[PDB]
Structure formats: C-alpha cells, structure tokens
C-alpha cells in the first residue's frame, strides 16, 4: 500500500445531440483500494439519482466502476464528474467534453 490513483473518463453513451436524451458516463479505473466517491454534476451541482456498476477489477488487480445517469445535453448546460479517493488530496473534477 502501495495505492493507485483512479483514471477518469467522462463521456456519453451515444453521440451527443442537443435536446436528445442520452446517458452521461463517468468511468473510473486503475485505482486501489476500492473505496471511491464519484458524483456527476450539472452546472456545478450534484445530480441526484446516479447508478453504478458492480465492483470488479482488471488483471493488474486495480478496480473499475462505471457511474451513469440519463441526461439531455444542450448547448449551455455543463456536465462533469467529481472524484475523490484516498490517493487524492482534493477531489478531482473532469468536465464533460463532447469531443472526448
């Protein structure tokens, strides 16, 4: 211990089309130990009903989880995922970029 910090990706299930319902994903991976906090944000505010996958791990023993919620992207609304883990001194914010 020997701890590993999460990789973080924030992206949509389907190509983003303003006004079209979709799914907002935050994939955290490569982390150890398994305890981790992940919030999805809409314009800086925490989205309420976010679901996640069952804890599993990769061949190198590092954990991964997918957090997701339905969302309808628009031109103005900003989305992000906020992650905290023991390896992090402060939460990490990764904004949703529809190009990534």
């Amino acid at each position: 211990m020997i701890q590993r910090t999460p990789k973080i990706q924030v992206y949509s299930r389907h190509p983003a089309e303003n006004g079209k319902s979709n799914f907002l994903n935050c994939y955290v991976s490569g982390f150890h130990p398994s305890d981790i906090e992940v919030d999805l944000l809409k314009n800086g505010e925490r989205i309420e009903k976010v679901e996640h996958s069952d804890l599993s791990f990769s061949k190198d023993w590092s954990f991964y989880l997918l957090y997701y919620t339905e969302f309808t992207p628009t031109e103005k609304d900003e989305y992000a995922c906020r992650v905290n883990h023991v390896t992090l001194s402060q939460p990490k914010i990764v904004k949703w970029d529809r190009d990534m």
Partner: protein
Amino acid sequence: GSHSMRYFYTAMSRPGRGEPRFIAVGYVDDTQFVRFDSDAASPRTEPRAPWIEQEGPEYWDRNTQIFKTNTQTYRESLRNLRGYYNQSEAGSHIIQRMYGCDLGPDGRLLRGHDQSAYDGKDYIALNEDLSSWTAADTAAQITQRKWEAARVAEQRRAYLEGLCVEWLRRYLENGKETLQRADPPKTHVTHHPVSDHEATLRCWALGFYPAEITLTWQRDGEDQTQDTELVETRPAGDRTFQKWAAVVVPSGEEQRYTCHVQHEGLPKPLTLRWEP
C-alpha cells in the same frame, strides 16, 4: 471464437465499521452475469444478464449458499493474512481472488486460472499445470503449505476442467445471440485545429463488442506508437465499448496519416483517413 468464464471476489476489512464486506461477480467474456454483495439488505445472488434468468431456484440457492460460505471464509482469511504480515488490527485490507476457465474456438479447455492478491499485490497463484502453486513471499508460503496439506490444487483442477467448462458451454449456448455475436466498431476520424501549424486527428471506434480492439495511427505506413494518445477502452453502458486514438500532425500533412482498426466484428480491417 475463444471464450472464458471468470469469478472475481473482493473481501474488504473495515475495522470499526462492521464485518469485512464480500462481493462476488461472474463474467463470461466481457459480459457480467451474476453478483452477490454481503452488504445488501437481503444478500442473495442476483442475475445481471438476461440469459441467466432462466436458471432455476436450486441454481440461485446453490450460488447464494456458496457465496455466504465464502463471506465467512474470507473474513477468516483476512484475519489470517493480517497475522502473516504482523499488521495491526487498525487498518483496512483487501483480498482479491480471480478464477475460471478459458476455451478455444472449438470449445476445448485451453487453460485454467486461480490467482489471489492481498492489498493489490500478487499473493498466490495456481500454476498452469493446475497442480502446483507460486507463492509471492514467506506469508503466502504459509497459505501454500495449508493448501498443499488440504489438496486444494486437486480440487481446483477438478472444478476447472469439469464444472467450469460445462457451465461456460451452457451459458454460451443460452446466451448465444449476444455472447457469440461480435458487434463491429462504428468508426470515424475527427479533426481539431490546435494552432496555426498543428491539428489533432482523432480516430473513434464506437459500439463494439467484445472490448478487444486494436486502433493505431500510421504516418507514411510507419507506426506512430510513441506519438499517439490512446485512451483506455471504456464501457458505453449498453454492453458495447468505446475507444479513440489521437495524433497531433503538421498542418497540410493530414493525408500522410492513416488510422487502422482491427476487431472481431469487422468483415475486414479498416483503414481510415480524415475526410475534410
């Protein structure tokens, strides 16, 4: 093609916050099909893929008993490993276990697996012979001696060569419309000017299953390995996966670059270029 079944167990101590939590999940290839969580309100094995739902009550009862027993075994094991490493009662620790069977394209056993880690570091593993162990350190040597005394390897071998393969072959048949269907990636190249004399070319692969994919950039037919940014393959949430690879190129030179895509679902490998 080839196929595998795996169970992944995670046991996590948390002194002061109750007994260690035990989770088990089961996969066939990149598709999860069962879960168990000792922290659930009423812990029981629950289906996570539609093709397993048809299994009867005895199946679910067998699974649940097995995982409840494991919950108690892993609690003892965490106490044992704490001892082997002279660790305090204060800290949280994790044992992870993986095991299962790999089949070749013909349905034959290719090899079996059983490996464990403690706090994310390899601890002990069943060798490919399904007979002997590799222990990482003098603590794991204690486990090895215990398992050698109880003839664990012989029991592992029996399961891996028998029930493991038998049940995997069943699941593959019952879930044949999905587990034995490769969905090729949808692909395209995007262009993002960075400055006056550089642009990013990003190659996308979307909607594919299974997760295995190769996605490279070439310049003049030469691999651009060091210069390519390659994101980890990521789940879309609908069973499929996504990936991209990006290269920053000199303005005007975009056409000396090709994106190559290899995936089971493809009638043939793709060669893509930016199409202004």
